[PDB]
């Protein structure tokens, strides 16, 4: 799912 640390 979408990460807060590396959202690229």
């Amino acid at each position: 799912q979408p990460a807060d640390g590396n959202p690229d």
Partner: antibody
Amino acid sequence: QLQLQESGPGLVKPAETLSLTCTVSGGSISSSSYYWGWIRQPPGKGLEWIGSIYYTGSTYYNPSLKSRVTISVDTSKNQFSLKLRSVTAADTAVYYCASIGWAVPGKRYYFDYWGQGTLVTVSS
Amino acid sequence: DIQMTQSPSSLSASVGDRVTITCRANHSISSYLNWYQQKPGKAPKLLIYAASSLQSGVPSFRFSGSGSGTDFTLTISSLQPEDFATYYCQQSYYTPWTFGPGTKVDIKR
């Protein structure tokens, strides 16, 4: 309380495609507060996240496996599934499905419900 | 990716002992850190999420987690025979999510 049921263990031949399905009971798979994922554990080793899916079809893959893996979802039957192409003995492992929640503030994901695990053996 | 390490890789401890396990990330992961307990032949079970919160069915005063950034600890108070298991940390800050290699907790008797 969710219960996640995987299809059972078996053989897959070298270079063919592993296919697994998880059926979710106790709640709808069409939930905007869950993703749904696959994790594996080679015998005697630790755990590796394979990938995940949201109930709309968006998918997220571990780059150590992104070429070979496809995950899909069937909200009508409360199911999601995993296909792993061109397998080798490096793929022999217990495969788990898991529901993926998170703890706000922030998307602090956790794996809160897990299937029982299914042992997949790559062999001739 | 974010490499997780744990120490020690195994330990033995007696019943009633206090046991602490350490998890390290090679990059800060804020509070995005979970602990799982895997007993033999079972799937991992979530014990601690968001570094320090208890999963709601876990009995109080038996497990606690602490830390932030790169260093985290799981503490087992009053070790019991049923706590025999491998304990894994796992980070959720950078994708791909990654698990530590696990710490096996054995019981001395």
